[PDB]
Amino acid sequence: AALGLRNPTVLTFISLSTAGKANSVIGLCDDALRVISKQRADLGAYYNRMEHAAKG
Amino acid sequence: VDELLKGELVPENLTEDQKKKKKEIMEQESLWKNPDFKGYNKTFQELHQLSKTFANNQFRLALSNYQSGVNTIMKNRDWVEQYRKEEAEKKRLDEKWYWQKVDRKAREERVVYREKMKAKQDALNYFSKAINHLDEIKNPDLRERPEFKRLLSDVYRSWIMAEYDLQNLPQTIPILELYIEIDDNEKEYPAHKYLASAYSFEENMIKKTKGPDDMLFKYRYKKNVHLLRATELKYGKDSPEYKHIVNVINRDEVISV
Amino acid sequence: VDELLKGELVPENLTEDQKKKKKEIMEQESLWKNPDFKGYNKTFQELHQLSKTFANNQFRLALSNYQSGVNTIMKNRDWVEQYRKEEAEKKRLDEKWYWQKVDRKAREERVVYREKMKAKQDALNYFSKAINHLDEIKNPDLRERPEFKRLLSDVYRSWIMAEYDLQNLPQTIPILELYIEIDDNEKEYPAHKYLASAYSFEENMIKKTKGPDDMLFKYRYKKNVHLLRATELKYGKDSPEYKHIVNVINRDEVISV
Amino acid sequence: SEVNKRLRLHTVLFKMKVRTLPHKTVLYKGKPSADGERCEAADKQEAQDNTCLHLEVFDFVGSEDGKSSKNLGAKFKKMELFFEGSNNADPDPRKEQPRNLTKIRTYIYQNNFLLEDKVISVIADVAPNGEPAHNDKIELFYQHDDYPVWGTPETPSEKGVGKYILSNVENTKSNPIRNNFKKQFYFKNLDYFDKLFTKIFDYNDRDSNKHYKKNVEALKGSLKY
C-alpha cells in the first residue's frame, strides 16, 4: 500500500491482464523503486553515522 | 422537500425535572475536570458513539466526501467538453489526408478515455470514504430519518455509477441490493437496469470457467427477475416491449411440461 | 422436577434426646476453644469430610465450575453467530471473482474452527475440575440423592461432548460407561452413539499398528453392541433401520457354522 | 429511604419463568411453610398460589486469596420476600401492579472449616411498608458456633445473643450501633438484592423477543430462492 502498488482504501493492486494497463504499470514500478531506494539511502546514511560514533 | 437542506442529520438544541437532572450531572463534572484523563477501559468511552453529536459529525464527514467525489465527476465532464472544444479550434496546417484525420481523431479519444478512468478512480476513492463514515453510526433511531436515507441512497447511486465505469460489475451486486431496500428506491428502473447487467456478467464468467451450474442458475434467474422488473417500471406491463422480454426470458429459462 | 432448583445436595437447618446430646458437646468445645490448634495426626480432622457441610461446599464447587464451563460453550456460540453475521454485513469493495469469495470464505471458516477449539479446551478444563470435586465425596448416602445424580450426569455429559470434538475419542470410553450407570441414562441412544464411534477408533488403531487379535476382537465386539443398542433406542426393533444394522453387524462379526 | 417500595415492583416474577441466572445465584418461587419463618419449594413454579420469592447468592471462603478450590468453607447470603394474596388471573407477567410486602427476611451464613467458626445472622422485617420507623418489628437472630439454639430469645443478662429486636439496641452518640447498622450494612444489603431482582427479570424478559426474531429471521431465508 505504501509504495503505491496497492490502494489503501479500495485494496486492489496493479494488474497486467490488459495491454493498456501494463503500459501504466511501468510508470508505477519506477516510483516504487524510488521509495525503496530513498529508504535504503537513509538506512545507509544512519549506519555510516553510527559507524563514526562508535569509533569516536 | 430537501432533506439535506440544513446539512445535518438531526437538529439539536425542556422538561424542568429533566432540566434539573442535567444541572446536577454538569456540576459533578466540574469537580472532576481533567482534560488529561485517558480511560484504561474504553467501554464507557465507546458509548459516546451513540450520542447525537457523534452522528452529526459522522454524517457531515460522509457528506463532505460526497461533495468532493461528485465534484470530480463534474469537473471531468467540464474539462472534456472544454478539451474537445479547443481541439476543433486549433488550426491543422499539416493535414491533407482523410486517414490523417482519423488518426488525429483517435488521439483525442485515447486522451479522453485516459482522463475518464483517472477521474472515476479519484471519485470512487472519495465515495468509498463516504460509505465507511455512514456505516460507523450505531443508532437505529437516527438510521431512519429522512436526512439519513437521502444521503445513503445518493452516495450509493453515485458510487455504483462510478464503479460500473471501471468495468467492476461483480462489486456492484451487494451495493445494488442494499440500494433497492431504502425508501421507494425499488420503484426506480435504472436501479434494476444495472442489476440486469451485473448478473449477466457473472453469468458469463461462471459459464466461461465451467463452474457449477448452481451458481449459473442463481445468477441467470436474478438477471431475468430484474430485467423484467426494469421494463415493467419504465415501459409498463402489458406493453409490446414487455411482451418481447417475456419471449426472451421464457426462451432463456427452464420450463417443465 | 428440577433437582438443581435450590442448588444444593442435602438441606441443612429434631429428637429431644439428641437436642440434649448436641448441647453438652457444645459445652466441651467452649472449654477447649483453640482456633490455633493444628492436629499432628490428621486422621481425626479428616472425619469432617464425612459431614454434610463438607459435601454441601463440594457440590457448589462443582456447580460453580459447571456454570463457568457451560457458559464458555454458550458464549462461543454467541460469538460464532455474531461473527458470521458481522462478516456478511461488511462491504467487500475488492472482490469480483468467484475464487476471491471462496478465499474469503475459507479464512472465515479457519477463524471459526480455530476459536471453537480454543473454547472446547477452556470448557474441558472447567468440567475436569467438576469431575474431581464430585469424586471426593466419601459418603455413599450423599451420592444417591437426586441432586447428585442430576449434576453428575450433566458434568459427565458436557465433558464428553466437549472432549469428543477434540478428537480424543479413546479418552471418552471410560467416562461414557460411567454415564450410562446413573439412573436411566442407559435408555439414551446418544450415549450408545458416542460409544460406537469411539470404539470404532480403537479398533482401527489396533489394525493400523498390527496389535494383538485379542484386543482387536474386544474393541470390535463392543462397537457392534453399542451400535445395535443405539439403533433400537432410536428406531426400535423390526424397523428398516434395525434390520439393516443387523446385516452389517452379522457381516462384520465372526460366525461359526 | 423509599427502598422498600421498590421491592414491591418485583411481584412480576411469579408469572415470569426463570431461565437465565447470574453466576452462583439461586432463585425460586414458593409458599410459606409452618410458622411462616421461611419458604418451601413448589412442584410448579408457575402456579399463582405461590407468594414467596427466595433469592440466594453463594460464594466460597477464601476467594480473596485464590484458594477457592482448597475447600476452606461455605458462605451464602439470601433474602426471602413474602407477599399476601394470590396473583392476578391473566398469565401475562409483563402487566402486573406492585403488591404489598408482608415481611422482608435476610439470611447470612458463613462457615470456616479450618477455624470451626460458624456464624448465622437472620434479619426479618415484618412491617416493610407502613411506617419509616418500625425498629421494634425487626427480628435480629445472631447465632455463633451453634449457640444459642434456634428460636431462643435474647435474655437481658446476655444482650445481643439470640433473637431480639432492634429497639433493644442502643443508638447513643457515643455508641451509634443503630446508625452504623443501617447506614453501612442494612441499606446496602437491600440495594444489592433489589438490583439483582431487576437484573434477573430483564435478562429473562429480553429472551422472549429473540425467539420471535428467530422465526422472522428464518422466514427471511425463503427469499433467497
Nearest-10 crossing angle of helices C146-165, C52-88: 40
- Strand positions, DSSP E, chain C: none
CA distance B113 to B254: 41
HSE value, Cβ hemisphere, 13 Å, CA-based, for C233: 16
Nearest-10 crossing angle of helices C146-165, C169-179: 160
Q: Which of C1, C2, C3, C5 to mutate to test the interface with D (most CBs of D within 10 A)?
A: C5
* First-to-last C-alpha distance (Å) of chain D: 61
Question: What's B132's DSSP letter?
Answer: H
Taking CB atoms within 8 Å and a gap of at least 24, the contacts of D120-124 are: D120/D144, D123/D186
Neighbouring CB atoms inside 10 A of D79's CB total: 23
Strand D52-60 vs strand D39-41: parallel, antiparallel, or unpaired?
A: unpaired
Phi, psi for residue D96 in degrees, rounded to 5: -165, 125
Q: Give yes or no for A12 touching C (CB within 8 A).
A: yes
Residues of A in contact with B129 (CB under 8 A): 9
Q: Give yes or no for B211 touching C (CB within 8 A).
A: yes
CA distance C164 to C194: 8
Q: What is the DSSP string of D204-225?
A: HHHHHHHHHHHHHHHHHGGGG-
Contact C57 D41 (CB under 8 A): no
SS3 D28: strand
Q: Which residues contact C200 (CB under 8 A, 6 or more apart)?
A: C223
Residues of C in contact with A12 (CB under 8 A): 94
Element (H, E) at D52: strand D52-60
Neighbouring CB atoms inside 10 A of B85's CB total: 9
Give CA angle at C180 (C179, C184), nearest 5°. 115
Contact D146 C26 (CB under 8 A): yes
Quote the radius of gyration of chain D (alpha carbons, Å): 21
With contact defined as 3+ CB pairs under 8 Å, the chains touching A are B, C
CB-based contact D134:D127 (threshold 8 Å)? yes
Cross-strand pairs, C10:
none
Would you state the cell numbers that stand for residue C223, as one nine-digit string? 462397537
Cβ pairs bridging B and C (under 8 Å): 23
| Sheet architecture: strand order including D52-60 | D39-41, D25-32, D52-60, D73-83, D101-112, D117-125, D138-144, D164-165
Amino acid occupying residue B200: S
Give CA angle at B145 (B143, B151), nearest 5°. 80
Burial level of B242, CB count in 10 A (0-12/13-18/19+)? middle
SS3 C202: helix
SS3 D62: coil
Cα–Cα separations (whole angstroms), residue B252 to B34, B170, B204, B217 = 70, 21, 14, 11
Would you state the cell numbers that stand for residue C256, as one nine-digit string? 461359526
The experimental technique used to determine this model is cryo-EM
Q: How many residues does chain C have?
A: 257
Q: How many residues does chain A have?
A: 56
Q: Which residues contact B37 (CB under 8 A, 6 or more apart)?
A: none
Nearest-10 crossing angle of helices B213-234, B190-208: 160
Amino acid occupying residue C25: I
Neighbouring CB atoms inside 10 A of B136's CB total: 12
HSE value, Cβ hemisphere, 13 Å, CA-based, for D143: 20
Strand D39-41 vs strand D25-32: parallel, antiparallel, or unpaired?
A: antiparallel
Q: Give yes or no for A19 touching C (CB within 8 A).
A: no
Kindly tell me the sign of the dihedral angle through the C-alpha atoms of C142, C147, C153, C158.
Answer: negative
Cβ pairs bridging C and D (under 8 Å): 58
Q: What is the DSSP string of chain A?
A: -TTSSB-TTT--B---SSHHHHHHHHHHHHHHHHHHHHHHHHHHHHHHHHHHHHH-
Which residues of chain B come before a gap where C and the next N are over 2.5 Å apart? 13
Cα–Cα separations (whole angstroms), residue B100 to B86, B103, B104, B113, C161 = 18, 5, 6, 20, 81
**Can you say how many angstroms the Cα of residue D186 is from the centroid of all Cα atoms in its chain?**
13
CA distance C3 to D224: 45
Q: Which residues contact D138 (CB under 8 A, 6 or more apart)?
A: D123, D124, D125, D126, D165, D166
CA distance B30 to B32: 6
Would you state the cell numbers that stand for residue D82, as one nine-digit string? 413474602
**Can you say how many angstroms the Cα of residue D175 is from the centroid of all Cα atoms in its chain?**
29
Write the residue in B128, B131, B211 that is nearest to C98 by C-beta.
B211
CA distance D198 to C226: 48
CB-based contact C197:C230 (threshold 8 Å)? no
Q: What is the DSSP string of chain D?
A: --HHHHGGGGGGGGSS------TTEEEEEEEE-GGGSSEEE-S-SS-TT--EEEEEEEEETTGGGT-GGG--EEEEEEEEEEE-S---SS--SSS-----EEEEEEEEEEEETTTTEEEEEEEEES-SSS-S--GGGEEEEEEETTBSPTTPBPPTTSTTSSBEETTTS---SSS-HHHHIIIIIIHHHHHHHHHHHHHHHHHHHHHHHHHHHHHHHHHHGGGG-
CA distance D29 to D49: 10
Q: Give yes or no for B131 touching C (CB within 8 A).
A: yes
CA distance C226 to C29: 57
Element (H, E) at D77: strand D73-83
CB-based contact D78:D122 (threshold 8 Å)? no
Residues of B in contact with A9 (CB under 8 A): 125, 128-129
Contact A10 B129 (CB under 8 A): no
Peptide bond preceding D128 in cis form (omega within 30 of 0): no
Quote the radius of gyration of chain A (alpha carbons, Å): 17
Q: Which residues contact B229 (CB under 8 A, 6 or more apart)?
A: B192
Quote the radius of gyration of chain B (alpha carbons, Å): 26
CA distance C111 to C108: 5
HSE value, Cβ hemisphere, 13 Å, CA-based, for C204: 8
Phi, psi for residue D121 in degrees, rounded to 5: -120, 120
Phi, psi for residue B130 in degrees, rounded to 5: -65, -40
SS3 C152: helix
The residue with cell 410448579 is D44
CA distance C160 to C127: 9
Cα–Cα separations (whole angstroms), residue C9 to A15, C12, C143 = 70, 10, 9
